[PDB]
């Protein structure tokens, strides 16, 4: 007889779950009440902040996304009320003084100047403007570097040329950012010495900003130690080329660190809902699990990892936001001179004596 | 010394209510708001829930296999047995707010394939022009579950199980559909029958479909529409003579009659229905109930436009009274404008960017 | 270089199986997920496999209309892997998954089912050998209404077993053994092999089992005396058609066919050796296994001794510990223990000390 | 045939509970019933039943006569539960439940009752620590009629106090302090702990409570003529049976109680940071310790720092507070605020803000 | 010897209810559930037009 089986009814959708923080873009957080065991600590994931982090390979995560998504971004975009999580995930510059910053205009200036000439770059960063949504510049930069063309209400459109980097990053899996400074008269790993901010104003330090990226043998093989890292390039030690964007792709990552500042900053102004939600005990914990990468190159980041290490990975909306306010404050905090910086089993150690002051992993680009 | 015999009236006094007692589908179950101060009365049909759950009648019906005698032969047998258990254990009601003439076609067409394996007098009594969807209707689900029944005893799990209830075991959700020849190759189309001709006139039967699927509920796949592989179309299954895949559209059809007919005869309670005005959760908790049926006939997804057209807060009286106006006018809004598209998983009419009207697939187990 | 090149390898391997060649020790061993420590946990797949088969009809109900895999590329290999052919109940000649001892369930399967399913690939006719696991796979899915082509597949057309029909409803179980003590029924400890029993048909009728329903609302009536939402299988109306003792000969023969596997691993001691580092191997072992220990006495000792050593043995260990079992026969004075079913349990108690207990096994 | 049908599970379960060994800061824990991921609901069933029984009569009806169940279990095992203990007038060693202030007034107790009570193993006499809560607990059965038996048990045999026969016609209780300012009676601040007034007995003069009905149906009318409808502690009527200092010691014996147990929280580090995400732990113990807080220096004061904090605190930052509360001695300045009545309402009041507010807590 | 006398609550909380149109003088409305009675039809009252008359 006839039959249509374009009819699927097929459901797996969940048991529960909530979002908090959702004008936030970076810190919007998805709650689940982890049903399947009787402890009751709910965990907490950062899906956005996931996301940015798998973008540093821009070319791999964005590859399925040039033929699937067809169905409506200015439906959405263009809606009465856009969300600001979605226009600056569709590179929209968003008006909003929480997400908008005025310091580090000088590194939009320069990527707006580099693909303005072949993009249509207004509303992604409005030319003479002093508020800039830092994500939404990350998201347009890696966009172009995987080879898109952004849209006023749209970015399907994958007919722009494709960067080399963002090819030379398929073979790869996992990065390191780190700072590196000219210390000994030889190259040399060290501290975050300048916040984000400072070194995306002044453009020239970028250049000391250095990553290390690393594959994934997925053989059933012993788990691999020293001696097999010749199978790992680091990101200056690339061959130079024109098209290959080295410096788009330090932006790309200063800008989402400063990002990720920038929300950090507003949410003390967040004080009804951080005490509206005390009881997430878990979001310290997801937060410094998920900011490792960034960790290595900004003073501020580092001093909050140190103190959430210390505390005990047991901090509440309101406690992180207090204690980043803080931090912004004083500035300084501990004498990290008496702790020395190693690197050990490929990971980045900062250690005082023989205890183990932060311990930090290499993420996964994706 | 003396027996200890007593008893404490351990009762909160307030409790739940239930309306339409006669009715067999439309009886529901009235609760108040939990404890919230909305007051906002909680509504819902259960043996409109049983119905919708016995399309897959094996694990439906399972538990009785063992786990009941529950001396049903008083119940059944009773001065005054409420219609309700009669239809529910297969027997025929004389009652005119529950029988209907439309139909009786397929009525005696299943009466004669089950007509020897059973004794289905009791069920359908032969050359009677009226007939209790309802009846048919659990009797097929239930010989179709490895049944027999007994006239006022209970059901004996002796008979044979069809193939369709044992491969409807590994399936959760149903959502049935229309078929149509457009283009030289098959298409989902709007009902064009109601099924009470589409009942009359047995060999439409053939245009039903309907497609299931499984539940996995692991968190994960979820968007994807590579689950088209974990489903299976009705008239894509196998043929084989024990497979009663005919039997099972004459009891999805008989039930939607069965409910048709309860919605015509709710007009005449006018009393109970003017009483119960306050209970505007009716008509959601209907609309919600009814989800597997619209897909199939015409003056279903009439009521359905309408109740969504008027926000899901409306009486029982709203309903009777919308619903004789379906029946009396015929088609009244305009589809040769409205649009029918499935969009994952989801039977729904459009009408330019509008969502006239969106179906998610029924539980079924 | 222009910057030092200090960088991140893995080679992070995923997936992982050993104790090949077997059908039901068979195990994907793999790290431990979410602790940082690298411990070995451990899952049988077909031994679980088997134990939710006891409720054919669900346990086989997918198949029936979804996968419809192609079955006949695999099974005509030149030398396709026996654990497939053995899911697929197909004879296998190798002398570590056969044995002597039972045979006349066999002959009883192949005459009560040889006539009307084809049975010779099954079983063949008259060998004084067989696979236990190929005819426990053959009658369950023959219950579940399946019928066993000789061509390497499956044919949902077979008529449905009325027991399998009636195990929907319940999705725990709990066999064990009986006795007529003082004129009325009371459980016992297994007083035989699965062989005597196999070979010994009518002593089979003295096995019996209860299922249990599932929920999720608060268990009621002391959690223990919720009675009227259990039955037990001799309990059940007695039919031609619902396979009483085609249910219990399934549950023998996947016990015999877990010893004889069992003694076939007892000379394995090589690879036991070379994996003897793996002792979550005897917890897993035992807390998949746990359904059959109330059946047979043989499986109890070997339970019993790895509950003694503490829920924690290695391969090599439970080889010998079985060998040694084997050869010795009743190795302790188990009279001086009691049996006890508190809180829907079965638990052995001598004095105060519980010395083994068991647990609710899901079917479904 | 063997139609032994033994029952198996039938659903599962949920819920959990904190300070296992604690008996009044034991805590109940259940998921929010709107949402699975929003404030968890605890909930304290000891102090719950410690505030109602000071109508002991009321408290303790049922189990003359209904609830004689079997309690020979619970108290003869090697290790039962404090809780069990101290609900059942036990004295136990344990240090966290055990003061050595206030001593006297439980030899008081002892004398009181002792005559015509085996109450050695309520408080052993010569004993330089006690347990305030069994003595409050034996109080209360022995006011209910109860006696303590010497097999560790109770009894209906005893007489019931004057006392306990007129609470049953009131619902809610109210303490606070008294004081002769200028020379007349006057509701004043507390001035003293129940740990140090427990010494001199004397001062338990000045402690007064108000009873008073839950009045006729009535769904708006704030008052029933409350002042006509209440009487207090110390404008009874005078008689040798009435307990009026037996039920003013018992009341500061389960607020000495509470106390101790909050000194014994700060060493429970573990279970603290391991339950930092209850954050209505510290809602809960405010809203249920209300009837305690007009008695004492330190309750008031924790209370105050509650309320400050917007109630939500988890049980480590409860602990530190208390901490400092003890070892701090008097912190807030409370000299700029006020005592006042509204509606029954007992309130302190800087200005116009109302820096606390205690309701009647419920007796039964 | 000492004694002071305080109040106590008219407990009849079980009859839940909430009101409409709070903006409004003579059309706010309070809605009672029905507590003497186990029939849902909610009973209201309009208090301030009963006041003005």
Redesign the interface.
């Known amino acids: ?18 979002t908090l923080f959702r004008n936030f873009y970076l810190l919007r957080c998805n ?3 982890d ?1 399947r065991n ?5 965990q907490s994931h950062f899906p956005f902040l996931s996301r940015a982090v798998r973008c540093l390979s821009p070319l791999a995560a964005h590859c399925a996304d040039r033929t699937l998504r067809r169905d409506n971004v200015k439906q959405i975009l263009t809606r009465e009320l856009p969300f600001s999580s979605d226009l600056i995930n569709y590179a929209h510059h968003v008006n909003s003084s929480s997400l908008t910053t005025s310091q580090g205009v000088e590194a939009a200036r320069l990527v707006a100047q580099v693909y303005g000439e072949q993009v249509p770059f207004d509303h992604i960063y409005p030319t003479g403007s002093a508020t800039y949504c830092p994500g939404a510049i990350a998201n347009a930069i890696s966009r172009i570097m995987a080879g898109f063309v952004p849209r006023e209400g749209d970015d399907f459109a994958p007919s722009g040329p494709i960067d080399y980097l963002a090819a030379d990053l398929i073979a790869y899996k ?3 950012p780190y700072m ?1 400074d000219m210390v000994d008269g030889r ?3 060290v501290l975050p010495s300048h916040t984000v901010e400072e070194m995306l104003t002044n453009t020239s330090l970028l250049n000391s900003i ?1 990553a ?13 130690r020293d001696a ?2 010749m ?7 690339l061959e130079d080329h024109d098209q290959r964007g080295r410096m788009p792709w330090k932006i790309m990552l200063g800008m989402m660190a400063a990002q990720l500042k920038v929300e950090l900053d507003a949410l003390a102004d967040e004080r009804t809902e951080s ?1 509206a939600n ?4 878990s979001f310290g914990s997801r937060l410094f699990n998920q900011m490792s990468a960034f960790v290595t190159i900004d003073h501020e980041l580092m001093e909050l990892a140190l103190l959430i290490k210390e505390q ?1 990975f ?1 901090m509440n909306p309101g406690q992180i936001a207090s204690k980043w306010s803080l931090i912004r404050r004083s500035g300084p905090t501990r004498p990290l001179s008496g702790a020395r910086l190693e ?1 050990r089993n ?1 990971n980045w150690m900062i250690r005082e004596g023989d205890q183990t002051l932060l311990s930090v992993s ?1 993420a996964r680009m994706a």
């Not at 009787?38 to 709910?42: D, G, I, L, N, R």
């Not at 005390?278 to 005990?281: E, M």
């Open positions: 007889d006839n039959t249509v089986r374009v009819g699927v009814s097929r459901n797996t959708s969940g048991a529960a779950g909530q709650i689940l009440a049903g009787a402890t009751k600590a709910v996992f990065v390191l590196l190259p040399q790993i250095d290390s990226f690393g594959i994934e043998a997925r053989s059933d093989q012993r788990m691999t097999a890292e199978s790992s390039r680091s990101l200056n030690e005490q005390a009881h997430v005990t005990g047991a690197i490929g290499p």
